């Protein structure tokens, strides 16, 4: 098992439903054409995942104000936290590419947003760390995550158009997901 | 002479400062190299601006749930609302390419986020319409805005190199800006 990973077992039901989902997917231009390529993207990404996270944490860990979010109260990086989160992140990359975007998925998007927000942050791994990830970086992270991703989508031998649609499906998925994760951060009624 | 366009005149100081902006630019990977390239995006965009809004309002306009936020209580578009908003939106495309991202720029980012949130929505043009634009769509719109932008950066004859640099800079500026806009949506201290 992957510790802390509780997909389909949140227990706890999302405040947004499947109609909300249809409507947000439309805002983000996500169609059945995108579900083909997001999963195609899975195949291309599966065995590259370790190297992706190395480029990811290499970006986080090269900025103090972002590494911050992984630190012990003494301002040193919690190595256990980093490594515990790394694994669920790994699994998310795959989930995005493999789960059906349904009630359970939605329930876990609620979960994940709660884990970034002060509501649930740090309870999953029983670490002591910063209480809240300020929402501004969640939005901002949309850029580096998407953009780091692009080379990795090519590397496994794919024709610019194959890569551009995989990329775009990934861009939309990320945006969509983040948008959903904003729920706990937003003043009630403004979501 | 653009009604309700109050850039530099907001009377109204932003709750995020310029060190916040440096850190957020950093999350978004935005550097001096991007400064140059949005600037260059501007020369390309300037004389296409009208067609971009036609592409843009076409998107808002074929989704009832999105046109929603421009409608009068009876559920029709407030055409006075769209025309007034379209002018300010025009100038924003230009401002993103043209202003230094300084304290002024930042004060107006605050303002704009207030005009989307219930705080100020509908007051600029003195109209009756819906009270709040739910934050979920603000984030979601990052994708359509960015992606609908790419083909326009290509139509003035530039290399897939230059065009890729101008696109990236735009994708970064948009995300960055939206991230800032979320402020009045987000519970206090969670941003
Ligand atoms: C593109 C936006 C982001 C994506 C796609 C993303 C993805 C993820 C995923 C998949 C997890 C683990 C999910 C799980 O628990 O099952 C996670 C947790 C975490 N991420 Fe993010 N993340 C984003 C933004 C950020 C930002 C901006 C930071 C700031 C450094 C950050 C730092 C963390 C931390 C500290 C955790 C552990 C949360 C906890 O204590 O449960 N993430 N993220
Ligand atoms: C990438 C995301 C978005 C961008 C770049 C953007 C851009 C803008 C700009 C530049 C303005 C004029 C600001 C000014 O007065 O100076 C505006 C206003 C407005 N936009 Fe957005 N916007 C975004 C998201 C949305 C969404 C999701 C909707 C929903 C349909 C929307 C609907 C509106 C409305 C109704 C106003 C008028 C607000 C008021 O009453 O003053 N916008 N937007």
């Amino acid at each position: 098992k992957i510790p802390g990973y509780t997909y389909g077992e949140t227990e706890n039901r999302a405040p947004f439903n499947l109609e909300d989902l249809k409507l947000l997917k439309e805002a983000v231009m996500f169609t059945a054409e995108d579900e083909e390529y997001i999963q195609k993207a899975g195949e291309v990404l599966e065995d590259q995942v370790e190297e992706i996270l190395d480029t990811w944490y290499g970006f986080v860990g090269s900025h103090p104000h972002l590494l911050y979010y992984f630190t012990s109260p003494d301002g040193t990086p919690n190595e256990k936290y980093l490594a515990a989160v790394r694994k669920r992140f790994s699994r998310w990359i795959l989930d995005t590419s493999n789960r059906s975007y349904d009630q359970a998925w939605l329930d876990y998007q609620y979960e994940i947003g709660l884990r970034h927000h002060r509501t649930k942050k740090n309870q999953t791994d029983n670490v002591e760390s910063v209480p809240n990830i300020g929402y501004r970086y969640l939005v901002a992270f949309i850029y580096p995550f998407t953009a780091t991703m692009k080379p990795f989508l090519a590397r496994k031998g794919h024709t610019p158009e194959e890569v551009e649609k995989m990329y775009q499906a990934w861009f939309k998925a990320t945006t969509l997901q983040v948008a959903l994760w904003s729920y706990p951060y937003v003043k009630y009624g403004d979501f």
Side-chain angles (χ1 to χ4, degrees), chain A residues 66 81 85 88-89 92 108 115-116 122 133 137 141 181:
Chain A
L66 298 177
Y81 200 19
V85 158
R88 300 200 291 282
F89 202 96
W92 172 86
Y108 204 61
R115 293 182 175 184
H116 285 84
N122 305 314
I133 310 184
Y137 298 111
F141 272 27
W181 302 348

Side-chain angles (χ1 to χ4, degrees), chain A residues 142-190:
Chain A
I142 301 184
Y143 181 87
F145 175 74
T146 298
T148 69
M149 196 49 83
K150 217 194 159 69
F152 294 87
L153 286 178
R155 281 194 188 160
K156 210 162 279 193
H158 273 97
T159 65
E161 191 171 3
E162 283 166 313
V163 187
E164 183 68 29
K165 294 181 103 157
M166 287 192 285
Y167 180 68
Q168 293 294 338
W170 201 270
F171 189 178
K172 298 177 205 183
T174 310
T175 312
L176 178 92
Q177 276 182 95
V178 175
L180 283 169
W181 302 348
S182 93
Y183 188 98
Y185 285 78
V186 175
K187 301 185 202 148
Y188 180 84
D190 298 347

Side-chain angles (χ1 to χ4, degrees), chain A residues 80-176:
Chain A
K80 102 148 257 204
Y81 200 19
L82 282 158
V85 158
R86 184 180 170 118
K87 289 188 160 208
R88 300 200 291 282
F89 202 96
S90 213
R91 178 53 185 196
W92 172 86
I93 285 177
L94 294 191
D95 278 344
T96 289
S97 272
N98 289 329
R99 288 295 202 277
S100 72
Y101 293 11
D102 58 8
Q103 185 68 57
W105 186 76
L106 278 185
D107 287 344
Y108 204 61
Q109 295 334 102
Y110 187 45
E111 188 62 16
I112 297 197
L114 292 171
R115 293 182 175 184
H116 285 84
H117 186 246
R118 79 181 68 254
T119 305
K120 283 194 106 158
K121 192 190 191 286
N122 305 314
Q123 308 192 25
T124 298
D125 311 303
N126 210 41
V127 297
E128 292 172 79
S129 192
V130 297
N132 179 261
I133 310 184
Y135 188 69
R136 81 191 76 172
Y137 298 111
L138 256 92
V139 178
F141 272 27
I142 301 184
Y143 181 87
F145 175 74
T146 298
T148 69
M149 196 49 83
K150 217 194 159 69
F152 294 87
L153 286 178
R155 281 194 188 160
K156 210 162 279 193
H158 273 97
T159 65
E161 191 171 3
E162 283 166 313
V163 187
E164 183 68 29
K165 294 181 103 157
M166 287 192 285
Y167 180 68
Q168 293 294 338
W170 201 270
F171 189 178
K172 298 177 205 183
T174 310
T175 312
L176 178 92

Side-chain angles (χ1 to χ4, degrees), chain A residues 55-76:
Chain A
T55 302
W56 227 71
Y57 290 121
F59 171 72
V60 187
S62 111
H63 290 83
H65 67 297
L66 298 177
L67 180 58
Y68 181 57
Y69 294 99
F70 278 95
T71 69
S72 292
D74 66 15
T76 65

